[PDB]
């Protein structure tokens, strides 16, 4: 179950050698150009297809982020690009799993890849901006008056209230009421 043992064991160098795993698979197709996709899976239900892919033909070959020699076998050596499924021979499912293993090993550190030297994001590196320093506080904020004092409820005189009632009587709704202050 735990990988990194078969790859250093004896049966690997007996069946395969210094050659890669995929150096023996030839996909069967209508001749000339192969289809520009492999099968989606070799293992349908719990049965294997007639010509298994290099990953699917050996159940011992487990794939994860710690299986670094397989991962560097399935990624190129002179270029930092991953081998595609028509090039290698693995399924679409196995290609997705091998890719996820590649980037999981890449951000877990157990795989070699090139990182370019990056130029600094900005030119001026000062922190003397109003967005990255303090600001002179508002008069309301040094006090506690609400900003834009027309936000506060202020009851009109009942003369204006009765003028409103004279305008919009008949279909008049219920009465007034000041806001509470603190939510539950």
């Amino acid at each position: 179950d735990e990988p990194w043992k078969y790859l250093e064991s004896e049966e690997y160098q007996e069946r395969y050698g210094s050659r890669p795993v995929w150096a023996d698979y030839r996909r069967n197709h209508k001749g000339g150009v192969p289809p520009q996709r492999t099968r989606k899976t070799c293992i349908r239900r719990n049965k294997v297809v007639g010509n298994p892919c290099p990953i699917c033909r050996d159940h011992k070959l487990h794939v994860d982020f710690r299986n670094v020699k397989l991962l560097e076998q399935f990624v190129c050596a002179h270029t930092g690009i991953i081998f595609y499924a028509p090039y290698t021979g693995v399924c679409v499912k196995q290609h997705k799993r091998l890719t996820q293993a590649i980037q999981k090993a890449r951000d877990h550190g157990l795989l070699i890849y090139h990182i370019p030297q990056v130029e600094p994001r900005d030119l001026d590196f000062s922190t003397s901006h109003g967005a990255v320093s303090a600001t002179p506080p508002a008069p309301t904020l040094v006090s506690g008056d609400p900003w834009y004092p027309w936000y506060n409820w202020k009851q009109p005189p009942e003369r204006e209230l009765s003028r409103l009632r004279r305008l919009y009587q008949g279909h008049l709704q219920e009465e007034s009421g000041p806001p509470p202050e603190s939510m539950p």
Binding site: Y148, Y151, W153, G177, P179, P180, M183, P184
Partner: protein, 116 residues
Amino acid sequence: KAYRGGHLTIRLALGGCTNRPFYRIVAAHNKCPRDGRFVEQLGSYDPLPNSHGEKLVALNLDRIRHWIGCGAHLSKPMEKLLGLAGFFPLHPMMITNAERLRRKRAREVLLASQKT
């Protein structure tokens, strides 16, 4: 086209999928389709929460100022969001709905107190 009568409008344009709204702040004519010719896209507004959760929005404030100076008519969610920003005053409608919720929650607190 020509659009006999009309004006520019800073508004939200839907660009998401089903059960996933996303809005783009654009400068479009009022008489054009919602997802159509905008003269320029001012920013972005995601109302959905992030994994951390912050409901994103970005505004190109100088070009917003430019199109307001050119005469763009703001739409009701748009002055809602600019008031929420602090580029515009807070909106009387939404502080009034805050007030309506004040009184509604006061009523349910009183009713629950009578229940208990």
